[PDB]
Amino acid sequence: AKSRTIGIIGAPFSKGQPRGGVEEGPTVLRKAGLLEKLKEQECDVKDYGDLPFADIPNDSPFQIVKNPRSVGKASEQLAGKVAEVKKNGRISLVLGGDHSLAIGSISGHARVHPDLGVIWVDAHTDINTPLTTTSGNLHGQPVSFLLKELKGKIPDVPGFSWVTPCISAKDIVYIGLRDVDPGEHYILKTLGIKYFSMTEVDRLGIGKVMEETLSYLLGRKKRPIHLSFDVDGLDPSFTPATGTPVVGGLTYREGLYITEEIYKTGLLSGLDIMEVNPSLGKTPEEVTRTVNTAVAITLACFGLAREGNHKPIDYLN
Amino acid sequence: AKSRTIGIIGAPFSKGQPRGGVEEGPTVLRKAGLLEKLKEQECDVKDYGDLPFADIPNDSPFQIVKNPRSVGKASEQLAGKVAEVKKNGRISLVLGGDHSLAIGSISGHARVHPDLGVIWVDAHTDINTPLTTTSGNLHGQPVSFLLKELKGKIPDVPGFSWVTPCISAKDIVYIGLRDVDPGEHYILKTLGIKYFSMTEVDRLGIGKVMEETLSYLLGRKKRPIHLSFDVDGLDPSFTPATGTPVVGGLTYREGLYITEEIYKTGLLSGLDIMEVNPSLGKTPEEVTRTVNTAVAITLACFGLAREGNHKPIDYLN
Amino acid sequence: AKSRTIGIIGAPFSKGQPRGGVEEGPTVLRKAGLLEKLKEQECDVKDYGDLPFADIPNDSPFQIVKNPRSVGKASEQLAGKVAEVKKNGRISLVLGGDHSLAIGSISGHARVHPDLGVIWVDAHTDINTPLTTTSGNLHGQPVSFLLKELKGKIPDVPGFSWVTPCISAKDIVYIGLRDVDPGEHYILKTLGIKYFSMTEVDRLGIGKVMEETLSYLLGRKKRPIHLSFDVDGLDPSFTPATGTPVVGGLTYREGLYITEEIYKTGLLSGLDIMEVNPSLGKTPEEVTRTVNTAVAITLACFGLAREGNHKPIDYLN
Numbered sequence: 001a002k003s004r005t006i007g008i009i010g011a012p013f014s015k016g017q018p019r020g021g022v023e024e025g026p027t028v029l030r031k032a033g034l035l036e037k038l039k040e041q042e043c044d045v046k047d048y049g050d051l052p053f054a055d056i057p058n059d060s061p062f063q064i065v066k067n068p069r070s071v072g073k074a075s076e077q078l079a080g081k082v083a084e085v086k087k088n089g090r091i092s093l094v095l096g097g098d099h100s101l102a103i104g105s106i107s108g109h110a111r112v113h114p115d116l117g118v119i120w121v122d123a124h125t126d127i128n129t130p131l132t133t134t135s136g137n138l139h140g141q142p143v144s145f146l147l148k149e150l151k152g153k154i155p156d157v158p159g160f161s162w163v164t165p166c167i168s169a170k171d172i173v174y175i176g177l178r179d180v181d182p183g184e185h186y187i188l189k190t191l192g193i194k195y196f197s198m199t200e201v202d203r204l205g206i207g208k209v210m211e212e213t214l215s216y217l218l219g220r221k222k223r224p225i226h227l228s229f230d231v232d233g234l235d236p237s238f239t240p241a242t243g244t245p246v247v248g249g250l251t252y253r254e255g256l257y258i259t260e261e262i263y264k265t266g267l268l269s270g271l272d273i274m275e276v277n278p279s280l281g282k283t284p285e286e287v288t289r290t291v292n293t294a295v296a297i298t299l300a301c302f303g304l305a306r307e308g309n310h311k312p313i314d315y316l317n
Numbered sequence: 318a319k320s321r322t323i324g325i326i327g328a329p330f331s332k333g334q335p336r337g338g339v340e341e342g343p344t345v346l347r348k349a350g351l352l353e354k355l356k357e358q359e360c361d362v363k364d365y366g367d368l369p370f371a372d373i374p375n376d377s378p379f380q381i382v383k384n385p386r387s388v389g390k391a392s393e394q395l396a397g398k399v400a401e402v403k404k405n406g407r408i409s410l411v412l413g414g415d416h417s418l419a420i421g422s423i424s425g426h427a428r429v430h431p432d433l434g435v436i437w438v439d440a441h442t443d444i445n446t447p448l449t450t451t452s453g454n455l456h457g458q459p460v461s462f463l464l465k466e467l468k469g470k471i472p473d474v475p476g477f478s479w480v481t482p483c484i485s486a487k488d489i490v491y492i493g494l495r496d497v498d499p500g501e502h503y504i505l506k507t508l509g510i511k512y513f514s515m516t517e518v519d520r521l522g523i524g525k526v527m528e529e530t531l532s533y534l535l536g537r538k539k540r541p542i543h544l545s546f547d548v549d550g551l552d553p554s555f556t557p558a559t560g561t562p563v564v565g566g567l568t569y570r571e572g573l574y575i576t577e578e579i580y581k582t583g584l585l586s587g588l589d590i591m592e593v594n595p596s597l598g599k600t601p602e603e604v605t606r607t608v609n610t611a612v613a614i615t616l617a618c619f620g621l622a623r624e625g626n627h628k629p630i631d632y633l634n
Numbered sequence: 635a636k637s638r639t640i641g642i643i644g645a646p647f648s649k650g651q652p653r654g655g656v657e658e659g660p661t662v663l664r665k666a667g668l669l670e671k672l673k674e675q676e677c678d679v680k681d682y683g684d685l686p687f688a689d690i691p692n693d694s695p696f697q698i699v700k701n702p703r704s705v706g707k708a709s710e711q712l713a714g715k716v717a718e719v720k721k722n723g724r725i726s727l728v729l730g731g732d733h734s735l736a737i738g739s740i741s742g743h744a745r746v747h748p749d750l751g752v753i754w755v756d757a758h759t760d761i762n763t764p765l766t767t768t769s770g771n772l773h774g775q776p777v778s779f780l781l782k783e784l785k786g787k788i789p790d791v792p793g794f795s796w797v798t799p800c801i802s803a804k805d806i807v808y809i810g811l812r813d814v815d816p817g818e819h820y821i822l823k824t825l826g827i828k829y830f831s832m833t834e835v836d837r838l839g840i841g842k843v844m845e846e847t848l849s850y851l852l853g854r855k856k857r858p859i860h861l862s863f864d865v866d867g868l869d870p871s872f873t874p875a876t877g878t879p880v881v882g883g884l885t886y887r888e889g890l891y892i893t894e895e896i897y898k899t900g901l902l903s904g905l906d907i908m909e910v911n912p913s914l915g916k917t918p919e920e921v922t923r924t925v926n927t928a929v930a931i932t933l934a935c936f937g938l939a940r941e942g943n944h945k946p947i948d949y950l951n
């Protein structure tokens with residue numbers, strides 16, 4: 001079935017942030033047996049491999065923005081691959097890798113499905129522009145490059161000339177926000193972007209959050225869903241092996257709830273599993289805890305249900 | 318008071334599963350001071366002691382089902398004792414022991430109160446038949462032996478000739494489900510059993526889960542409540558000394574709220590505190606935590622409330 | 635603005651309870667950078683230093699009530715300091731110290747604003763009178779001395795002749811309750827005080843709790859809010875370094891939601907951060923975890939929103 005037909009893409013890239021190890025995200029997600037478990041859940045899994053990311057010598061910074069040609073090139077490569085997966089009538093599954101890869105993952109998806117709606121599950125908005133940013137880490141800027149309403153606010157940054165803004169400010173829902181920069185908060189308010197920060201999650205409950213998110217995107221008519229899951233969206237008690245952990249996250253339950261609900265529409269068209277850094281686990285159990293969580297999230301995106309699952313046969317015979 | 322007049326039944330039985338230690342459950346629960354805490358809570362506690370489970374050597378498996386004669390006998394002995402306690406006018410308080418014992422606890426209770434409704438708090442449905450089981454562990458099968466609709470789906474199991482299905486599919490509500498086998502999911506959905514898996518708990522909140530659970534069971538008319546409580550229903554962070562732990566469970570708070578709402582109906586007639594395995598705590602602290610949580614749950618069933626409690630006297634005098 | 639103008643008062647007092655250390659609370663919270671953090675979120679902060687609590691040797695018990703002259707004098711000195719801060723048009727921020735200091739904090743606040751309402755975040759009611767108390771510890775009795783309806787039930791305790799009940803029973807809302815004494819529960823139900831114990835928070839969700847709390851206190855008319863935050867109101871998994879911890883507490887997110895909702899009214903006028911004891915950490919990390927949770931709740935009271943904040947400037951220029 002279309003909802004369980006998947007194209008796997010390994011994106012072992014870390015240059016959108018300063019912390020080493022996140023490029024090993026595809027390796028540990030694979031080692032934990034992600035592909036085998038998905039196949040055991042009656043999925044049609046095709047593996048497009050791990051993208052080779054060539055080292056860019058003399059990748060000088062654009063103002064304070066670090067590794068601009070490397071980040072741009074890696075997303076350009078990813079955009080090409082995601083579009084090929086989408087042309088094959090499969091759901092693209094990107095195993096990251098830092099969140100700057102969303103530039104390519106979404107751009108690639110929009111090339112085949114321009115009517116796509118984006119759910120962004122993260123502690124962060126990742127919407128700083130190359131000029132509002134204060135760290136110059138591109139993993140905190142991919143939404144700025146993608147938004148149509150920010151065309152003219154993003155300067156010519158090396159490695160990004162291929163990029164065209166493909167999503168309107170009204171086509172994205174944020175779930176999980178708790179660490180947002182002033183410039184990001186300003187953009188969020190001025191562009192009238194829909195979001196459920198942790199305050200909204202506490203207020204309405206994950207049930208009402210998912211009802212409002214799906215009605216906000218699908219209300220008019222069914223349209224393809226791109227879910228960009230940053231594992232720091234969940235609390236560091238579940239996903240500690242991450243680069244930018246923020247206390248008071250979404251529980252293990254809420255995350256499964258979000259992903260089970262998205263599966264049920266049968267409209268998941270693109271997925272990103274981002275920011276798992278296995279070198280950032282204080283103990284070996286902290287890595288395994290994060291990896292296993294990222295696996296459960298992925299499995300729920302393709303049908304694994306807490307109430308149970310069964311083959312369409314008679315088990316009483 | 319009726320909802321405070323209790324009769325304790327200790328069931329040191331472990332042969333319904335393969336992990337040693339669960340038989341020590343009634344001892345470690347008594348050693349925590351359970352009886353005393355209940356007395357000090359204005360409860361009429363009468364000790365019916367611990368049941369003597371006579372060892373059955375050469376208990377050859379029935380197909381894949383392990384130690385059937387032992388499990389059949391233990392529950393048979395438990396049914397007589399539970400029925401005796403119920404004839405005395407006391408709430409049966411069964412101390413487990415593995416969940417296979419729910420066979421004898423409910424059948425015994427049903428002999429005195431045939432109209433009873435069951436609230437099953439577990440991570441698991443325990444609804445496999447001696448044929449749909451892959452483990453052959455009878456603690457994962459007690460609901461299949463008790464359901465009327467599955468008469469003809471259960472074969473001649475040695476030790477279970479005394480068993481007569483005492484409840485219909487409509488007379489059971491599940492709360493806390495998160496690890497359901499395909500056979501069990503097929504049973505649950507074809508039998509059309511009411512359930513609240515963790516997905517429904519997240520969607521609704523425990524307030525609505527209980528309002529809906531109790532309305533569905535008690536709406537039509539007042540009826541006896543049998544709460545079968547598997548400590549693995551609660552997340553492993555509150556009850557880690559259990560044989561089959563599953564991540565993302567009911568919190569300590571939801572557990573107390575379930576039992577507080579059941580107390581408040583004044584219709585609790587049977588209680589099972591199952592699967593506390595003191596030999597499975599990863600530290601002596603993990604054992605005491607599971608035991609105190611199990612004690613806390615039990616006290617809430619018989620009136621202990623988080624807002625407080627007082628006697629019918631003027632305290633300002 | 636009025637909601638970000640603050641007068642910090644240190645109240646290094648411990649004789650309201652037996653465990654040494656709570657007097658270091660103002661020190662450790664200052665050392666965590668509270669003053670600096672508040673100024674980074676556009677606050678006008680004045681520090682009135684730590685109150686000298688000149689020793690009162692010869693302070694024998696009044697019945698079973700411990701250190702009454704010390705508890706009385708500390709609250710008398712605090713009341714005068716809080717009123718002086720209130721007269722200066724600043725939100726009084728009392729860093730405790732044990733919760734017995736609420737007598738003085740609220741009496742002093744009431745002196746300038748007699749129309750104030752109280753929000754009491756705690757695991758306990760702190761409503762024992764000198765006659766209902768079993769422990770004789772005054773941190774468990776502050777509310778009794780303040781309620782108009784309890785006048786006549788308060789005996790003549792040495793060091794408390796300055797006290798006049800300043801709040802009515804209908805002007806206090808409790809949140810977080812889970813350990814209430816029999817005498818306390820009797821007072822709570824007989825006076826008809828609005829309370830949301832952990833049972834209500836479970837039933838309703840913190841969103842309804844806050845909506846009902848702010849409507850119940852401000853629905854008739856807008857008046858100044860006094861928030862008295864006992865850190866033990868949160869689960870000991872976030873605030874373990876405290877004198878009287880109780881499991882099943884308010885989560886980290888719930889504490890931020892309560893304070894976020896209170897800040898948004900723009901009526902917060904007095905705040906108490908009580909019961910932080912840096913000697914009671916089982917590990918140095920449990921101490922830092924407690925102070926940081928206390929600091930986070932505080933910044934939330936003075937505007938720090940999880941969704942983010944921005945200045946009224948064009949960040950895109």
Ligand SMILES: O=C(O)[C@H]1NC[C@@H]2NC[C@@]21CCC[B-](O)(O)O
Binds near residue numbers: 134135137139141
């Ligand atoms: O733009 C920035 O560098 C920062 N702004 C807010 C977060 N604190 C680190 C930030 C990035 C997080 C990216 B993320 O982990 O969400 O992929």
Ligand SMILES: O=C(O)[C@H]1NC[C@@H]2NC[C@@]21CCC[B-](O)(O)O
Binds near residue numbers: 416441457
């Ligand atoms: O039939 C089985 O062995 C298995 N089926 C699903 C559960 N995972 C282990 C199972 C049993 C749980 C029993 B219980 O701990 O709930 O008492």
Ligand SMILES: O=C(O)[C@H]1NC[C@@H]2NC[C@@]21CCC[B-](O)(O)O
Binds near residue numbers: 774813866877
């Ligand atoms: O009267 C008492 O001592 C006890 N009554 C219930 C609580 N258990 C300890 C008590 C006080 C809590 C004070 B508190 O930490 O809230 O300031």
Ligand SMILES: [Mn+2]
Binds near residue numbers: 099126275
């Ligand atoms: Mn991100």
Ligand SMILES: [Mn+2]
Binds near residue numbers: 122123230232244275
């Ligand atoms: Mn993030």
Ligand SMILES: [Mn+2]
Binds near residue numbers: 416439441443456547
């Ligand atoms: Mn069970």
Ligand SMILES: [Mn+2]
Binds near residue numbers: 439441
């Ligand atoms: Mn179970």
Ligand SMILES: [Mn+2]
Binds near residue numbers: 733756758760773864
């Ligand atoms: Mn207190």
Ligand SMILES: [Mn+2]
Binds near residue numbers: 758866867909
């Ligand atoms: Mn307290």
